[model samples]
Target chain A: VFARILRAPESHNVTFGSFVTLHCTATGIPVPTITWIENGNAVSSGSIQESVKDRVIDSRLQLFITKPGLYTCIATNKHGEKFSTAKAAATISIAENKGYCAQYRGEVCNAVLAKDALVFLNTSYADPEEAQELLVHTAWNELKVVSPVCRPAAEALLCNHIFQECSPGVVPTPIPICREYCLAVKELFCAKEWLVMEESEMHLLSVPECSKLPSMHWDPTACARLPHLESRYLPEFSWPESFVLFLRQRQRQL
Target chain B: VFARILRAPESHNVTFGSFVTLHCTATGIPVPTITWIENGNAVSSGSIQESVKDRVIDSRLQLFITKPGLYTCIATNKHGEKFSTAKAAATISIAENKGYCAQYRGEVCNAVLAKDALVFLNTSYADPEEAQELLVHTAWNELKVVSPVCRPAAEALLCNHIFQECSPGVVPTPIPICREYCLAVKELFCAKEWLVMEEKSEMHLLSVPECSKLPSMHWDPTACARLPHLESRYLPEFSWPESFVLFLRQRQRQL
Candidate 1:
């Protein structure tokens, strides 16, 4: 009789050169209708897509905040309306080239925290931004379906690889990704009958091939591990493959 | 002018909430400095316990870990740096301890034969008898490969649930399996393609406990008894309420 929300759109702040994705998931009888309202008007200015199942609807609204606004969603049906609102704002800043991070915006790394562990350096993903985007979306896809054991480690592998860890010293050195991360992800998610990595593909792997990675257990440098991260940050999540193609077109600045 | 490891740490696999120790000792001319590096970060000396002895310089160090990860030790002196081969440890803890095993004899179930900490009860499956039989064998057949790395934990969950644990006082009650353990084991093994295909011939598990019926130890912790990762069993330290009484024994010196 009432529409309830499972996942709701969260507020975001983006720079002029950047865009934001607003995701909403809601459910009720007779399948509700979703409308995106921007600054008091019914807005249709972004790429919108939906996945519907069991009366639940997951929709992503990719909005370019050339001029930012308060974006909201209302899921409507005969019984009731479920509402979620997210605000987007523009900001100006410069990416730094020094510190514990070459670029320390925690935007990507914090989005994928694994049960209180710091999966990535806030600065490490600046250069691999595209891979970072792919990592975020792919994690969103897998976390929904994977079992309990798989989520934390998967978050660890994706965040650690995408954001990476840089050893702090006068000369900051990038720690090599642990091959064990690949092995654990593969063994847990994609293990084959003969315990084969070759056959563990349940779906097209959204990330790199494990076999192609380097053997991880030889030296101390290869296994540089992370103690749990003490600083707290709430985890952020995202999705939409089309978001990728959209960002690529924008990255070139044509 | 030589640096070498007198004692080195070996890789260990342990269950969650359980701790494992990695010990390292090195001998050299100048009493080499010892440092531990985990992943790539140099761990603080405070995290590691060490003792120094003067038998021409033997530096002893030991580390205790509950969190699973890769750890490496390095000894350095003017003669150059000597690396202790890195040791890796894997942890498989995902549930809470509920009861003890009294005496459930089965092949696979026996390896999990813990004393005060038991996996199953003698009377849990006495009627069907074969229900327990099928559980132990299926675990052996599937977990050995499907989760050899995490074998013991999964093994414990299946056996503990089938036979159930004793409250360990006199007669034991069957603690419901923790939903967290079920959720983890299934996510770890239940969702696999091989598991589904292998069970196609009607050997599917019958009357598997509704994991939904049990409270998640992760969520509600004490509402239900938890299975060990099953592949690995756990220690049954007294619960906080009882352990406090045990500690009070130290102050009175009544004994």
Candidate 2:
């Protein structure tokens, strides 16, 4: 028996800042011991999940989104060995109320009706330092229009790229830009007032195509788990009224 | 690193019912371990010649040839693994002194000549009883032509596939036919006339490619000494000349 590639699937979407899992299966004479190897080292079990049976072994690999390159699953046994096919493309997006909006540039810009007007950007390296610096510059630009205190925090949200929907692995890939701001609907009782939160710990977003957000477990099995948390409770999770209005009015310009 | 093919030279001339050795050399990161797997099991250390230096190791595999087939050298390491690309071809020849002539249709045929006119067969799984029965047939064939006491003893060689080469972990692929015959060549001292000869034993004729003739040694560099006689030599070192001729005649037919 000889080793060979077994997976027959194509690229699938994944939310930003989420763990990614990819599986490849193979068959052989004496059951092959399948392992996911990357850079000559075996990938740990935490990354992906695998299933082993008689003559077939399934390799699962998981990893946090530090950056994306090639993640490979290599399987082998006494008869021979084989490798998995191409890399799986994972995606992340940030948007307002699960969809896009358009805003004209000016004091009277209306963000509410702007649909597909802006594509939110995704996060790159998670350095709060760089984000803080970018926030200061944006604050200077909007000093007369909004409180100076709000400008730095707004910059941090933009750096988060939640609004831009740009994928995280690469910086240069052509992706849409954010044209309008969406007020954070939900707020946790952190230290102060309702601070227009823009980020979530969850992987997939409430995007237009598949608003049925990703499973909290991030496991494939999680897809079938019914009565999901976010899908069931929208009223409590909705954003603040003033914050949403503020976000719309500021985006009157394109 | 990935697995690849190992390369080595072939052992050209081997004798039938004799032993032969084959080798290959390959390099790998973290070095590699070498082994000769026959019929899915590793050949014993006694059947292999080993050398170690600077993290690199080599083993020459000895195979007892009953028939020709593919043999392989498998080298593996954490860095990578590789095997010989193909089976090494082997040719066995009879020692010229062993004589047996053939006459077909009243025409004299020099059986000793290295030609395709005659065939020498080989078989690894020879049935001792069947072989004994066949020996009587060979004796009868010679007795009809020459006086039994005057004629030299002869053996019938079994012929399997003549073209097959050696493979790893397998007896050569083709199962050749088996027949038994006595060899014309015997120890002169072992003959009935040498009843007074000293008790010193007559060693079997060694073919250059015979596994026994291949180099074997245990190096004790500490004492600057080499040991070849122990550990590496095969047990039951003697083989009959009839089997040896079977191997030789096969080679002659190919030539």
Candidate 3:
């Protein structure tokens, strides 16, 4: 009358629009019915295929995933039912370093990209030219969105940036336009009509000049490290196998 | 072919859920094609019934409006199309003073009712007791919404207002809790922590204490007139009928 899952569903990451296998094996005196669950729903065999083997009733669940979320596998027998624990839970992350801007649409795309790339002088990205163009478009579109009244002034400044010093490689040349856009938004939106990096500082966030401005007057950092902190992808630290003994003891005591 | 709309849709106010008739009467030499347009879309008789009337192809379009927006009627002939212009445009104002808290759900009901009633102290409404309770609930809910950290202090203050001070027909006594709620909100939400109303002082607007506070160091008649001004609902001035005669004279000259 023994029934226990021999192999639990192991979590794995997959690229967007790729396939991944989730295998679960169980053994019982009588054959155990195996099922795969995703976010508290039975995985449909009609859309995905399931592989069954004789190694203690080994069953493999294969998924051709378009979206990303949690997945689990369960097995039930006459003795009891055993489902994959969160320890074996999976998080299908959209593969990192793809330089994919999630939700890039309209002026928001330019706004987010400019805030991401040009906030710092030493900021580096995979596509510097696109990033710079996005920053320029952010300044250009900002004039249209934030203050249409300042459009004429912002337009002439943008044209002047291109004519006077906006070369193919020059970074700081278009900064004047960015600065003007910041001031323009500040004129309408900001309470003090200026940029200072703070959480409650509402108005001046889109332009590179405003976003990079430090809160403290004497602070040497060009901008707040928000862009850097948001962009940096740190690796997850995992405990050794021996550390699981402590967790198991704690779990049993609980 | 002469095709001109005589009576365009006149602006009328109706209750939130009430229906209104948008009539467009046009006299065409050869009967014109009549169509009712609402929010840039042609209304089909398959969807809505068109009320027929006297004038040459007179049609009244009745709208069962759930939401608020613009409605227009257009009439076209061999000459051209004539739609309702702004001159005869109807602004369907959701009939005023309904005591209708627009979205009376959750804490927003109390918040909005308090803001609606208490902001303008002279704001006359149906229920005074309920309004006072809403103002108290607004203060109590402000503790829950704006600053939960100050709940213990605000809770005591609220209970004190209820136990010690809250009596039938008493106004100024209950005002202290409202004042405290204003100060608490000002502490969290306002730009400045305190309220000393001065012109363009860019702070203190969430509570009545701040909103009603005079924006001056010394008490003056002109600054104080603002409260009286807001309280007084002035009469709508009527133009003399002779004024339109001038307009007609100018129109003839221009034509």
Candidate 4:
């Protein structure tokens, strides 16, 4: 009895996480045995199972692949066996992981508070190098701090983003700077250090704009002409202890 | 109603000119359809055909290929479809052409006579450059000649090796020099002109070993000692009329 494939599966090019179904149909006097062959090996022993009709042997193999390559189908009867080759066979290339990250970056960054912060950051960009850049820049711009020292509290915020209650499928967009968060980070940094009262001549201090601290001896130009003693020359001109107390008191209010 | 691949096609690593049969089996209530795929496309089209039973569907794909790549198998039923992936799929590397030539060099050289001599020579070895070396060296050592000029008759011998009929199944082993063939090539070389004769004091002659002619002034060492005077010094040392008459008479008597 003669056997032949009546219809064949169409080849696919799909993105990561997408699924594909390979289809084939055959006809024979004795009902030919339909089988799926990938590269050159049989498929049944793996995690994915092949679907088949016992009485009539049309078949379908459906799968999602992590890697890309070739696949083929075969049909056989008592008389003979036939197979497909060349363009007739499947040619598969998984959409690159970089492309996936690029498509889902906003979702990943917004969801950072829900899971491990770096884990979210790592997957938010196309690659490790880019992921690191985003993570460091976010800490500096939004929290006014560097990582590691800043990472613990950032982890807390990131976990909250992922686990706290929200709309069923809504993903919030990321803001460039979170002002409230930066203000809180400044308080934490200030309390951990001895905040110097005045700028020293040897080591000039250029204060951060976030702290609203002025440059050394800064004042209105009208006072520039007043009979001003050079502070270093006057032994009585010590740093104002009251001013230091006042700065600390303001920090506590925040 | 449930479906699964009971047996999947195993991946293959084969050499060139070999054939592969991709085998897979699956079972499900309602008899799931079985299909084969290569790369990402279906297999039953264009050059290759697929086989299946009319009433019951068990399928197999068999093909001969010269390229290497991946192959997949899929099975589907009323419940759903299942397929093999990754390691489960066949990953084929074309059997190397080098291996094929090694196995069939005897047949290839034998067939050289049927086609252009170089074509067979090229196929006889793993690489063409080495094949060329073998052909040129063989001509030089065995027949005592270089190629191109010697190529015409050499072509005939090589062609005989390539084209002449032999057992269909057997591949003969390669022989470095074909004795009878080399002798015939020597004969062909011998018949060609001037075959340059010997070297002299003034002008060197490039004589082929096949030619018997000697360079000018060649004579026996005993005759050199017997000479009474230098021909340049004595005018009378020239051959006499009497000697000339004697030589002519000798030549006529031989005739």
Which CAPRI quality tier does the interface of model 1 achieve? incorrect
**Candidate 4 — which residues are off by over 4 angstroms?**
A43-56, A80-88, A96-254, B1-255
Error of 1 at A211 (Å): 17
In candidate 3, what are the lDDT values of residues B1-255, reduced to their tens digit?
Answer: 566677787877665434355777766655554565555544321122244444366666544333455666556556344533222345556655312222122231332232322222212323332233333443432232222233343434333232222212334222223443434434644323122212211001221244233233134322221111011111111111222223323433564
How close is every model to the real structure, measured as TM-score?
0.27, 0.18, 0.26, 0.20
By TM-score rank, best first, the candidates go: 1, 3, 4, 2
For residue A3, give model 3's deviation from the true position in Å: 33
Interface RMSD of each: 25.2, 44.1, 34.5, 54.0
Error of 3 at A242 (Å): 52
Q: Which digits, one per residue and each the tens of the lDDT, describe model 1 over residues B1-255? A: 455666766666654323234667766666655555555554321124457676233332232233445666665555444433322222223222333354554444565646445544333222233335444553444333343334555566666677665554554566567887777666665546345534631122432444667777867665466655332112111111222223223322443
Candidates, DockQ: 0.01, 0.00, 0.01, 0.00
Candidate 1, DockQ score (0 to 1): 0.01
**What TM-score would you give candidate 3 relative to the actual structure?**
0.26
Summarize candidate 2's per-residue lDDT along B187-224 as a digit string, tens digits: 22113312211221001121101122222222322221
lDDT of 3 at A19: 43
lDDT of 4: 0.38
**Candidate 3 segments whose C-alpha is farther than 4 A from its true place:** A1-103, A106-191, A195-207, A210-254, B1-10, B13-255
Of the true interface contacts, the fraction found in model 2 is 0.00
Which 10 consecutive positions of candidate 3 chain B have the poorest summed lDDT?
Answer: B227-236
